[PDB]
Amino acid sequence: STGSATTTPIDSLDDAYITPVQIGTPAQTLNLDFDTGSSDLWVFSSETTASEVDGQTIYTPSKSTTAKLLSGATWSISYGDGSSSSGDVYTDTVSVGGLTVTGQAVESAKKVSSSFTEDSTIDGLLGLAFSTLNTVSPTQQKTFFDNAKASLDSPVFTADLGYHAPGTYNFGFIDTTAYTGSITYTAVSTKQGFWEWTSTGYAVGSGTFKSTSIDGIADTGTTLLYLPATVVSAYWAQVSGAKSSSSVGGYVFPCSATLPSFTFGVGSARIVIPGDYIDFGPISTGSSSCFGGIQSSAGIGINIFGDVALKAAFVVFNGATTPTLGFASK
């Protein structure tokens, strides 16, 4: 089997991407944030505290003939940005882009944090990291990918995120029309439950490439590119008037600037992030200070190749017995 679904930016900045997902029978279509940095499929639901729902589409298990309570199971998750959610669990039929899994754990939110409530465009998350990070207790549950894997033509999914445009998530096949050149594969560590890999270095603009190992995660659920402070300082030093603002919470730059590109290494290959991908616009409406899309990881504990980096590539998440990542230009 295969599946193929379009993923669409939630706003003009590409802050996140939503993908329609069919849950239940008859289908209830919810727009989920596919997150390669977490492992829970959770949804706004008929159980979510009413004051915490503001425009999201909800899953109503009682209206699904295939829903079954997963008795005793609860979940609770906290994300890198400080957001959180928790609740109970149903199993149901879940389809993405024509690919169906029966018996998928669908984590029904009873509570969500303010950032989720305030984002009316995101109806929940679909985790695509390794199932070792799934938070369901007392019986950990599998991701949609892990449940689908054995049925897929190839045990892979791909992320092809657009810059200010829709893109695609494919499951079970590699669309050889979707990228240019060849795909460079690189090793993955699953020790922390993430798609963790080591970049071979970076360049700023037309500068020389610096060979240096940068361990980090491929995380579709993170907007920005978070890298070591040395690398980030080297980038923003090439932008007149850029500075790190403790009041704003990262590097800002004059909205009048033209940003340089940023290149990262994948083995001997190179992925170039155009400068415009690094512009996240005014810090507040009407400001002439703009927020940068490359930020320091120093206060995180991990480097994160988030959407700023991933949308410059066609990215293969190879879930074979020995997982690997692949990157191609496009």
UniProtKB/Swiss-Prot annotation:
Catalytic activity: Hydrolysis of proteins with specificity similar to that of pepsin A, prefers hydrophobic residues at P1 and P1', but does not cleave 14-Ala-|-Leu-15 in the B chain of insulin or Z-Glu-Tyr. Clots milk
Active site: D35, S199
Boundaries of the shown chain within the full protein: 90 to 419 of 419
Keyword check for Transcription regulation: no
EC numbers on record: 3.4.23.22
Disulfide bridge positions per record: C255-C290
Name of the molecule in the record: Endothiapepsin
Record flagged with keyword Signal: yes
Residue span(s) of domain Peptidase A1: 17-328
Family to which this protein belongs: Belongs to the peptidase A1 family.
Key words, A-Z: Aspartyl protease, Disulfide bond, Hydrolase, Protease, Signal, Zymogen
GO BP term, pick one: proteolysis
Any one GO MF annotation of this record: aspartic-type endopeptidase activity
Top-level taxon of origin: Eukaryota
